[PDB]
Amino acid sequence: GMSEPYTWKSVVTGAGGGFVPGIIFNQTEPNLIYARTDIGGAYRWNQATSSWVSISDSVGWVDWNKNGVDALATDPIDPNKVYMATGTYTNHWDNNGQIMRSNDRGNTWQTTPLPFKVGGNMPGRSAGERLVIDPNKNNILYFGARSGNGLWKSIDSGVTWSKVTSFPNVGTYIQNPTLDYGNDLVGLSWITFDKSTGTLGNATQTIYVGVADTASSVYRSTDGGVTWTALAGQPTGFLPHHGELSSTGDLYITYSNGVGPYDGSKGEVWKYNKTSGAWTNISPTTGTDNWYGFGGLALDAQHPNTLMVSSLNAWWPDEVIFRSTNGGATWSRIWDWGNYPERTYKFSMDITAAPWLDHGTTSTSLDPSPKLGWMMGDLEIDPFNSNRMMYGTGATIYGSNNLTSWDTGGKVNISVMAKGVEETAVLGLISPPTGTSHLITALGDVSGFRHEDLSVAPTKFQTSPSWATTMSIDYAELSPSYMVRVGSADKEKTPSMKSIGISNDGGVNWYMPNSEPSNGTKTTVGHGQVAVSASGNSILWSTSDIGVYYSKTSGNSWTASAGLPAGAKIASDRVNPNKYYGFYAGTFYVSVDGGATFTATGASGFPTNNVAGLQPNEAQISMKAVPGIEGDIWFAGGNTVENKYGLWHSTNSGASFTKLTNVEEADLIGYGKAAPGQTYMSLYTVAKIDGVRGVFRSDDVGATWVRINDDAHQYAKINMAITGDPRIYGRVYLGTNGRGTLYADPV
Template structure:
C-alpha cells in the first residue's frame, strides 16, 4: 500500500525587468508553517554528474561544487561533508536547481555567485538567473536574465562560464549559451549588461537536426579566465580570456579591460576549448580541447600552451590528436598554484577501460600517466582506490581485466588541485566526487589513494518511495541507479538493486497484507521487451558481480523539506521497460512516465529526506535527470587490442555496437530524450 507523498514546497518570488531585477532574497532554510517534523537526508552519497568544482584561490578549504540538476554545495572541512545551498528553490523556479556555472570571490571571500537554469529549450519555461550571496550561500539574491541557462544541457561540463575579476571584484563576466554572448556586471552581480562589442557568440551545435532541440542549441561561450598579473588591487584586470564554442575561433582575448576583444592569432583550430586556465606567474594560458562539447562523447583533442609574452602556441598534449593512440578529447585541466609548472589533465571521455589522468611537473614538456598497460590486459597503477565509504560505487560489478570496479570515473570535466595544498585534489564524475590528500606521492613514484569525498552531496532522481510497515523502513525507486533498500537511513546502503538489475525504477508498491511482496516497473539495460519478475521480499542488493553494468547515467536532485510529486525527466533514450511484480502479477499503481520528451515537473527535483517522527516518511519526485551514473563497458564479444601496449580502440569495436565514428569506448548513438535516461 502506498504511503502518501508529502506536501507543497515554499515558493520563491522574483520580479524582473530586462536584466535589472528587484532583488529576490532567499534564506537557506525558508520560512514554513509550523510542523512537528525534523528533516534529514537519507544517505546515498552522490549518485549523479558533478560537472564543476571550484576552490576559492585565497581562502583555504572554501570549496563549491555544482551539479547539473541537483543544485550547489559548499564544503565543510570540519565535518568533511558538503552543505546544500539551494534547498530553498521551490516548484515555481524548479529549473534553478540546474547550475551551469559557479564563481567564488577571491577578494571578499564570503561572496559567491551561481548561474542557474535547467534547459535552454521550452522544457524549462523560466529564464535563467545569476544568484549572488554575501554569506557563502546562506542567503541569496537573484537577477533574472532575459534568456535561459542550461545547467542540464550539452556542454555543461565546460567552464567556468562565470568569473570574478581578481583585482576589482565588483566586476564579473558571464559567457552565455544559446548565442546570447558575453555579459558583464560592475556592481557585484546586481545588474548585468551585454558586452555588445564581443565579436563571437559561438556556433557549435551537437546535432543541429535534433527535433527536440536538446542537442541543437548553440553551446555559446564556454569559459572566462582573468590574468591576475595584468591588474592591481582596485583596478580592472586588463587581460581577460574567453572560450567560444566555435572550432575555428575557440579563444578570444581583451588586453584593455574589456574595451575591445580579438581572436588570438595563431590559435589551434578544429576543436572546442573545454577549459582555459591561466598561469599568471609564468604568463601562460593553458587550454584543453575536444572535438565535441561533451560531456558524454569526444574522440579527439589536444592540450595547448599560449605564451602571453611571445604570442606563441605550443601543443603539449600527452597524446596528440595526430597519434594513432588518440581516441579521446581532453578536459579536467588544472594547475598546482603552489608549483605553477605542475599540471594535470584528464580524458574528457574515455569509457574503456577507464578514464586517464596525466601529470606534468615541467609545464607540459613531459607527462606521466596514472595507469599504463604492462602486458595486456594487465595494468600498472600509480593509485589505489578505497570506496568503502560508498561501496555501491562498484555497481556490483566484477569486470574482466583490463576493466576494474570501481572505475576512476567518466565525464571527468572538472579536475582541481587545491590552490593551497598540493597534496589535495578533487574531481567530479558521472556518479560522485573523488579526491586524494596525498597526491604528490605520484611524483615520487609511489601510489596515492583516491576516495569518495561526497558526503552530504545527495544527487539522485527520486522517482518513488515506499515505507512498508515491516522490514526496511524505506525502499527507493531512483533514476539510473535503480534504487536501494535502506535499512539504516543514516548510513550509505552497500549496493543498489542488482537482482534484478535495473537502470531506473519508475514506481513502487507493496501488498497491504504481505508487505514483503513488492511490485514496480523499471527500465533495464539488457531487456528488449517489457518483462516482469516476482519478489517475495523487498528488493535486496545483489552480491558483488551479480550486476550487469548498465549504460552510463547519472542521477541528480535538489533538496526541499516538503515536496510534491512531479512527473517528467530529461535526456536520452530510455532502455526498454521491464519490471518486477508480485506473485499474482498485479500491475503497479504508479505511472510508467514514458514520453516522447521531458515535461516540466510540478516541483523541483528531489532527494530523499525523512522525518524523525515515528510516522513513516515518504517524500519523492520524479525529475528532469541528467548525466550518467553507472559506467558502461564494451560487450564481452569485443576483441582485445591488437598489442599489449596499445591504447587504441580494439579492432571490431563497431561490430559490437560501439560506433566507430565516436571513437573507442563511446556509448551507442542515442535517440531523442525521454524519461529514465539522461544525456
C-alpha cells in the first residue's frame, strides 16, 4: 500500500546522446552483443527488434557508482554469464568499485566490492577490454586495474578477487598530473587470451596484457599467468589502446600518444607475429601525415586478414576509418580528398532515427553534418557477419549491415544503431502548461529538446544559440510561450554566439539577445541558473562566474542585482511578476522589485551544503514556487553531515518554512496536475521516506506519500531534475545523470 505500480518509459532521443566507449560481441553465440557507457550503465542487444535493453536500471541511490561501466566480459562457454567492472571515478568524487556478475545476461546481478576504485568515467575508458574470461576455463577471470592496483584475478567465476603480485608493471602514464581529475595512474589497458594455448576445462596458458606505459606497454605470460615478460622488440613512445589476436597468429595493436577519449595527436599501428616474434609497423599514416592516435581496432573473424582502425582523434574535417584486407600491408580510407576542398566518400550517413544529429546545420565538405563520429576508441566487426559493423562515438552508436560494400566499389550505409539507448545528463525539465509539447529538456552535451511525441526522436537541434550544454531553462508561467535557456557558448568557434537563448513560441524557435551580463572587466561565460518572471517581463540570471544579473529588455541589456550573493540558486514566483526568490549557503532571499534587490528572510534551518567531503553528486538544492499560488514555495535538499536534509514548505513568500517531519531526506521537488477531488497540485519528490529511497507522489500537500518507482527502475543518482505534468495527473518526468529522461504513469 506504500507503492503504486507505474509504467516507466524513456523519453526517446533516438541517438542516446552520450559516449559509448565499449561494444562487446560474444565470441560463441551469434547476435549476443553488449554495450557499456561511462555514466549510464550497460545494455544488451535485442536482435529481433534491432534495439538495446538496459541491464542497469536497478542500480540505485547508494550504489549509484555501478553505472560507470569500465569493463565488461561476456562468457564464450556459457553465454548466459556476463560480468562488469563498475565504479565511476578513481579520485575523491567516488568510493571503491566492484565486480558484478550475472547468470541471466544482465537481468539480475550479484556484486563483489573491490578494495580500490574503478574508473568508468575516467581517462582511458575506451581502451580495453580490461575484464576478460578465460575462453577455455570460464571460472577464471582477469581484471586490469587503475591507479597502480595492477592485475587482479578470479578463479571462482568472479565471486572473489586477488591481486596477481607477479605482474611487473602497474603503469606509469598519468594524463593530468597537476589536476584533481586524472592525476592517478591510468594503469592497465587491455587483456587478450590466446585460446589456442588451452583446451576446454584447462587454463589458457598464454595471456597478453597492455599497460599504459610509454616505455614498455605489452606483456605476455606463457605459463597461465604465473610469470610475465615484456614482449621483446616492441615499439616505445605510445600507449596501446587495443590488442586483438587473429586466427593467423598475428597480434594487432593500435597506439596513441594519449589514453583518450579526447586527446591523441600522434599514433601508430603494429602487428606482432606470435610464432616468429617479428614486429611490423602497419600504421596507415606516419610522419606529418599523422596527427592523431589510433583507437578502435576491429578484426574480421570470418576473413582473418581483414581489419579496421579508427583515428582518435583527427577532428578535421572528420575522423577516418582505415580498412585493410591484407593484414595491414595496405589500407583503404573510408573517405578521400578529391579536388580540395571536395571529398569523396565510401559511406553514407543515415540519421533518420535521430535527425537532430545534424545539429541544425547544413553539411559541407569541410564541416560535415552529421560527422562520421568522434571519440572513436572502439570499433567492432560482427564475428558472425563480416557485413555488420558497430562503433561508439561521443554521442551515439553507429553501425552498418553492408560493410563489405567497401571492398566492391559500393557505399557502406551507416545508420544510428542506438535504439533504446538513453545516456544524457538532465540539467533541467519543464512541462509547459499549454501547446503541443509536454516536455522541454535541458541536457549536457546535446543541449536539450522540445519533445512532442515522447516516443519520436526530436527533429530539431537547439540553435541560435547553439551550444553543448543547457544548464537551466524556465518559462513565464502566465505567458508560457515565452521561455529562456542559458548555457555556455563556444566563442572561439563562434565569437558572436551568446550563452542565453530566448523563445516566443514555446521553444520551437530561439534567438540570441544583443548582450550578456558583464562586470566591466569580463563578460559572463554563462551557465548558472535562469528564472523568468511570471508575466515574462523580466529575466533573472544567476551566472556561474560573475553573480546575479537581471534584464527588463529580454536580454538586450543587463544590470547587476544587489543583495544576492554570487552562485545563488534562484526561482521566480509563478503569479507575482515582481517577485523572485534566492538561496545561498543556508540563507533564503526574496526580491519584490523584479530582481533588482534581494533581502534575506528569517527562514532558518536550511542546509549550507558547504560540508567538506561531499562528493559532487551527493547533495542538491531544489527550490520552486507553485504555479497559481503567489508566495508558495517548496524546498528540497541538504545532507546528513549538517543534519539538515528534507523537504520544506513556505506559503508566505519565504519569510518562514515548515520542515515536513514525515520526509527523512529529500533532494528534488516538482509539481503536477491535482488529483481528482483535490485542489492542490500533486507533489513529486526524490526522497527517502520511511526508510525507503525512491520517487514519491503526494496528492494531499505532503501529508501522505506513495512510491511510484520500484527497485527495478531506480536510475542511480537521480538528484538531477523532476517535474509533474500540469495537464496529466499522475504523470512524472524524471531526469537522470546518464540514463536520459524517463516519464511514467500508473500502469
